[PDB]
Amino acid sequence: DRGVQMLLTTVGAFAAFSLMTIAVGTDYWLYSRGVCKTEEVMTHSGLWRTCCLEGNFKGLCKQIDHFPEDADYEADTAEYFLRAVRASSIFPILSVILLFMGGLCIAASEFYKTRHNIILSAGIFFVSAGLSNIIGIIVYISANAGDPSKSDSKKNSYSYGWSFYFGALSFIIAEMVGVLAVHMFIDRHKQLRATARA
């Protein structure tokens, strides 16, 4: 049914957008021992700052420095490019923006019933948001492999938090909603052709 499909698509789009927004903002991305305001202690690393956990200075959210220029080293250009991409968090933010645009397209689709191309644009935005979320996850993990505290699971035993899994769940919902949006675009054009046949 058109109504239940639209309701499910709207609910899923809102859920994915909220999950992505929470994941970007929240700092429970990774559990790893680190030093606040660079004493080492267990911390929950996020996307911009990491706060001390069960430590002497517990609650100190030290900002994550993405350019360790202590040794004044540059190495290759690719490492600097990856560090810059991680630091700006361009891809999770782009995923959030694309999810918002898809949601606004879905909302505006009700106002403009005769314009079926809006629903297709919403589906494209949702799929692109999922792709950007995938890129962001890949870049995040790759840059995390640079530092020993976020790597070496054998000894460090780092753990991913619920905020990271919120973004993982956000990608799945956005892809699921993108399937529904394309299905509704297909149904709308099929109905238009069926009406013209009569």
Partner 1 sequence: EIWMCIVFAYIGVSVVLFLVSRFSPYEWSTNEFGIFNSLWFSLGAFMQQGCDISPRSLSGRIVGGVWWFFTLIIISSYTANLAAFLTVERMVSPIESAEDLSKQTEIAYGTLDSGSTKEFFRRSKIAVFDKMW
Partner 2 sequence: IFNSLWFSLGAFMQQGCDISPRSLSGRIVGGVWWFFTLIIISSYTANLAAFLTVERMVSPIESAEDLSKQTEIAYGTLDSGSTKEFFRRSKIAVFDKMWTYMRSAEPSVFVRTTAEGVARVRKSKGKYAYLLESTMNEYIEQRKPCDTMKVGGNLDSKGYDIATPKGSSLGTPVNLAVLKLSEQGVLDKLKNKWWYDKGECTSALSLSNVAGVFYILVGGLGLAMLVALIEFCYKSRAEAKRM
Provide, rounded to whole angstroms, the least separation between the CB of residue 137 and partner 2: 9
- Per-residue x/- mask for partner 2, residues 106 to 125, rule CB under 8 A? ------------------x-
Residue 30 makes contact with partner 2 by CB under 8 A: no
Please report how close the Cβ of residue 191 comes to partner 1 at its closest, in angstroms: 11
Rounded alpha-carbon distances, angstroms, from residue 89 to 31, 49, 156, 164: 19, 13, 25, 14
Residue of the chain from 145, 148, 159, 190 that contacts partner 2 (CB under 8 A) = 145
Residue 182 touches partner 2, criterion: CB under 8 A: no
DSSP per-residue letters across the chain: -HHHHHHHHHHHHHHHHHHHHHHHH-S-SEEEEEETT--EEEEEE-SSEEEE-SSTTTT-EEEPPS--TTS-----HHHHHHHHHHHHTHHHHHHHHHHHHHHHHHHHHHH-SS-THHHHHHHHHHHHHHHHHHHHHHHHHHHHTTSGGGS-TTTT--EE-HHHHHHHHHHHHHHHHHHHHHHHHHHHHHHHHHHHH-
Site track 70-89 with partner 2 (rule: CB under 8 A), x = hit: xx------------------
Of 3-11, 95-103, 126-134, 173-181: span binding partner 2 (CB under 8 A): 126-134
> Which residues are at the interface with partner 1 (CB under 8 A)?
120, 123-124, 127, 130-131, 134, 137-138, 141, 154, 168, 171-172, 175, 178-179, 182-183, 185-186, 189-190, 193
Cβ atoms < 10 Å from Cβ of 111? 8
Would you count residue 65 as binding partner 2 (CB under 8 A)?
A: no
Q: Please report how close the Cβ of residue 188 comes to partner 1 at its closest, in angstroms.
A: 9
Residues that bind partner 2 (CB under 8 A): 70-71, 124, 127-128, 131, 134-135, 138, 141-142, 145, 151-154
